[PDB]
Design a protein around this ligand. Structure first.
Ligand SMILES: CNC(=O)c1cc(Oc2ccc(NC(=O)Nc3ccc(Cl)c(C(F)(F)F)c3)cc2)ccn1
Length: 247
């Protein structure tokens, strides 16, 4: 069992807070993150712990334990650095194509793993891909998001391995263009209607000129409106892993 008895974790700096939990930096045999949940959100707690326990993979945020006294707390490793989102869209940081692809490859490894464990992420986006120490991808759920929704998710079960695939295609888009899709649509409501209705889809011409042919192909395959035309992560992982053998 992975329960951590009361009194063992030293709870430090409050890191961020939301409708569904508050996260602190912690000390428990070194640095951890501690996510506090209110007593009323027990079910959420069990469900989040339930999925985290199912995972042991270098590109997934490492689950370490939980506490029921005196609070509902989830304990993960601590990551240093910032979200892929922050790297791509908030910092003049322009990655090299080799680095971009390596990020794609690691994200794909993580997502491939999650699906192998029968886990649909449901909320994949660049805000949830942590660049631990600038190098290693840690996929988790850091939320406490329409841009990454498949048309079928938009329309309102809509969540599948293939809706995850689509979100990942949108991550690919960000990596390959540096931008977010639909940057030219000032209206969130418009994006929801048009993407749902079929009317709207990302402009793939916005990609870097040094973007690999195999990657533009892949991206577009991940973004297919009919979810059954989208490829699975083993294929995706294999095409990327092949592509990265451009060394
Ligand atoms: C600057 N550094 C930090 O701010 C920092 C903050 C942290 O706080 C966190 C605490 C808990 C979580 N909880 C999850 O991620 N829950 C999760 C749910 C579903 C699924 Cl599917 C998964 C998945 F995909 F991993 F399996 C994970 C995420 C982040 C951790 C490390 N570092």
């Amino acid at each position: 069992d992975w329960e951590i008895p009361d009194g063992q974790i030293t709870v430090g700096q409050r890191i961020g807070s939301g409708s569904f939990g508050t996260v602190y930096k912690g000390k428990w045999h070194g640095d951890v993150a501690v996510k506090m949940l209110t007593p009323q959100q027990l079910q959420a707690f069990k469900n989040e712990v339930g999925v985290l326990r199912k995972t042991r993979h270098v590109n997934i945020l490492l689950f370490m334990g939980y506490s029921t006294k005196p609070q509902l707390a989830i304990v993960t490793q601590w990551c240093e650095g910032s979200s892929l989102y922050h790297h791509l869209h908030a910092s003049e940081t322009k990655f090299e194509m080799k680095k971009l692809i390596d990020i794609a490859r690691q994200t794909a490894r993580g997502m491939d793993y999650l699906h192998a464990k029968s886990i649909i992420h449901r909320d994949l986006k660049s805000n949830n891909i942590f660049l631990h120490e600038d190098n290693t991808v840690k996929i988790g759920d850091f939320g406490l998001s329409i841009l990454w929704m498949a048309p079928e998710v938009i329309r309102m079960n809509p969540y599948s391995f293939q809706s995850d695939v689509y979100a990942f295609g949108i991550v690919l888009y960000e990596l390959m263009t540096g931008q977010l899709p639909y940057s030219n649509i000032n209206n969130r409501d418009q994006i929801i209607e048009m993407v749902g209705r079929g009317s709207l889809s990302p402009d793939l011409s916005k990609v870097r000129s040094n973007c690999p042919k195999r990657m533009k192909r892949l991206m577009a395959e991940c973004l297919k409106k009919k979810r059954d035309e989208r490829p699975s992560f083993p294929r995706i992982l294999a095409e990327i892993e092949e592509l990265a053998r451009e060394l």
